[PDB]
Design a protein around this ligand. Structure first.
Ligand SMILES: [Cl-]
Ligand SMILES: [Cl-]
Ligand SMILES: [Cl-]
Lengths: 338, 348, 338
């Protein structure tokens, strides 16, 4: 199972349970199809592409115990992004890994300059143990997009730099821990009518775990991507952490650092509360790194065990729910805007 | 054979004895039974599968902590059967049905899978009780592993200490962490449809030669324990210990002579909890948790009335149907769920 | 590249992008130089050395997207450490890896008995996505030293035994999560005039994330390394967590165990607060595992959601800042001493 540059990756994956790339070599792949579980040992190779993606389309089989596994592999989606081009349906095609019904492990890989999601995971029908760790993302529209009913995955110890949206979140119950983002407009996005919902749609969404993450310089002092983001049927204004869905609950949120990590809690299920727990909230001067909740749900939001500076604004959360005192608190019913 | 090669049908015992590093045939199927490792070796699984037969374990690892080389096993699947009978009472004979039995472990296990073990998939013990001031011997790491259909995931006996069990995924196991040995870090693990993620009490299975010594008091952070008592788990609540029966919970602690781990950043959607007894010179906090339960008595968190003043619930979110029993209202900041007193809870 | 013991490492690294070592074999390398990115597959090998270090000198290129990667390799700096000799400028040379302008991944490696920092990362000018995970450190003066402007790294799931200073922290914005330390005098050090600041100096320091870590038996237990530590211009008295810089901010601190994990918060930037969040704080009998904050900054320090025993001492933190009540609290203007 040794796959040379120029040989058909499709043939090699069909013929072998495990494939080893030539160490450090350069590949050029386009619309590869994986139909049964295969392990790839990338050996520090690089996979380039051109034209409409994805680079690999992975047809899953959740009954089969053997996962698809990709280790130690670089994927390049092309040159540096034009970050001003509006996102579109045709650009959603520009993926590294499009995975349906995924039982998959992605470890120690790098993803550079994808026009859409570097990694997209969807479910063919509504109802895996997915793991994405130690990966690097640079210059990508979206880092990892999990569609509805892709649940209970783990994305941890990954580094995101210069990505518009790190986690395009739909499917529920993922653990996202120990991840670093800098100069990314959005680390966490969840709302209705997203891209990359997949065949199960926007079902049992979000409500997972977001711990020990850093989202720095989202809205100020490094990020280059636009705030305004085109969904399929409306335009929104992203934030480092953006949540707008009255029919969904937020994830558990503890141990995270926000240095210009602006946050907008626009709407969530009324039978819930939310805590910004054990966090570091630094912002200012001016309206930079602002944290804001919908006035109608502010009594259900708390800021507990947080540290911060005077310049960090907290908008609409009542004073009684901020223990201990952190930043500067105010009421402004114009915030947060969608 | 070539050095470092091990084909199916060849002797695993002989290959490990003659090599410091062994590479398996990529993707191949192996069939191994009562294999003995007597010195440190690394195994590169290369996506292989190992099946077995009879009373296990598949590998018995005789560790030497004075040797600085770890036994390292990577990228290897272990299968202990077709699918679990979940109704059989657990027993002394079933404790044999292990993948890895490790004594005095200096070990790294990573990228591995464990399916349908009748006992603990991984059992770690000491040949003797460790009362030295050389702490955390072995520096054990178990990470990026998947467990499913297993009676017990990882069992760490007395005096196997300061291990790390992180970024693992447990599906359909009765007890993920059978906890005896103290000071382990367990972080960022995902459990779904497992009756119990964390068990510690007196008179446990898998205590090893050191016994129930210096137990628990570790770190338990950023973990998810979902659908433990409702809406997914299929294993029985009733669980047979060597000398008594208990009723498991997602998190079960009953030991007057031991302290609970640090507990912060954990998600509990039907992750029931029973704090039955712990050492009095201690406090416990459910810190920065997500506590979702209801309707009815589903996902219930309960503390013994005698010790309730020592338990706090700080920085937690949750829904109305989440019950929190016996913890005083003043100890819950901010308010979460529906608080109640009930001196009959928790039962053992 | 299959590099054998006795062959020239330098020439091997210059001619291949990826190199595989002989599995299990012993190597002896001294002042090896890496000038272009390269991956080393260690295969459970061991690298010994002699004379003035470092073992490998790695010249980084931050513009090249291929990282330098070292996996599954053991580095040995001696048979056992010399712990009581005063630290010095010449001894700073006794390193495994010296990394200038690093884009580096170190995974599953082990580091034994280094007289300076096992791993030293520095920046050749003031302004990497660096990752150090699943590594073992035994017997080292210093585990990981990150210089100024070496930022946004990740050091996680590492284990430290019998090291003087696990993390010599200068450069800002690191995520350090899920690491275990026993019998190490100090897990986290940050002050002014440190060793290993690097050409960029003491710039934009610390203020990262320190979550889910264990720092046990720092001042009581089996630790052999002196509390007295020679900096270039003075001697300090180490603790488990040591912070003394009026011009820098502390990291976010959540989910950490401190069983005889003494802590000294001596000075930090006034425009900030600090929380010991979600902690386990166990100490005593006597003055063991003591946590103390400078009286002038005490009102900015909180202890939120922590558990402990009676013998844990918390010094100068006001009673109103400790929620819930944990351990034994007192005032003493003489602590912390530097
Ligand atoms: Cl989520
Ligand atoms: Cl524990
Ligand atoms: Cl820091």
């Amino acid at each position: 199972g040794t796959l040379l540059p120029g040989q058909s990756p499709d043939e090699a994956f069909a013929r072998n349970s495990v494939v080893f790339l030539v160490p450090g070599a350069e590949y050029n792949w386009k619309n590869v199809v994986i139909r049964k579980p295969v392990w790839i040992y990338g050996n520090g190779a690089t996979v380039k592409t051109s034209g409409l993606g994805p680079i690999i389309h992975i047809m899953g089989d959740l009954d089969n115990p053997m996962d698809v596994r990709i280790q130690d592999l670089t994927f390049i989606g092309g040159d540096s992004p034009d970050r001003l081009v509006p996102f579109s349906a045709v650009l959603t095609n520009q993926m590294a890994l499009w995975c349906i019904d995924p039982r998959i492990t992605i470890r120690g890989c790098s993803f550079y300059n994808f026009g859409g999601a570097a990694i997209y995971l969807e479910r063919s029908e509504r109802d895996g143990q997915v793991m994405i760790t130690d990966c690097r993302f640079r210059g990508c529209r979206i880092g990892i997009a999990n569609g509805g009913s892709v649940e209970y995955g783990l994305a941890s110890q990954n580094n995101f730099s210069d990505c518009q949206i790190c986690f395009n979140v739909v499917g529920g119950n993922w653990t996202r821990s120990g991840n670093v983002a800098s100069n990314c407009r959005c680390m966490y996005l969840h709302t209705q009518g997203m891209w990359y919902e997949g065949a199960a749609g926007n079902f049992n969404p979000a409500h997972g775990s977001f711990t020990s993450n850093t989202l720095n310089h989202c809205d100020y002092g490094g990020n280059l991507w636009p705030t305004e983001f085109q969904l399929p049927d409306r335009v929104i204004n992203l934030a480092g952490f953006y949540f707008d869905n009255a029919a969904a609950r937020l994830p558990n949120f503890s141990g995270n650092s926000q240095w210009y990590g602006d946050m907008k809690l626009i709407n969530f299920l009324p039978d819930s509360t939310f805590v910004i727990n054990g966090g570091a909230l630094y912002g200012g001067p001016g309206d930079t790194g602002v944290i804001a909740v919908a006035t109608a749900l502010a009594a259900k939001v708390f800021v507990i065990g947080c540290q911060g500076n005077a310049g960090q604004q907290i908008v609409n959360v009542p004073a009684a729910n901020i223990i201990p005192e952190v930043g500067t608190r105010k009421d402004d019913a114009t915030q947060p805007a969608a």
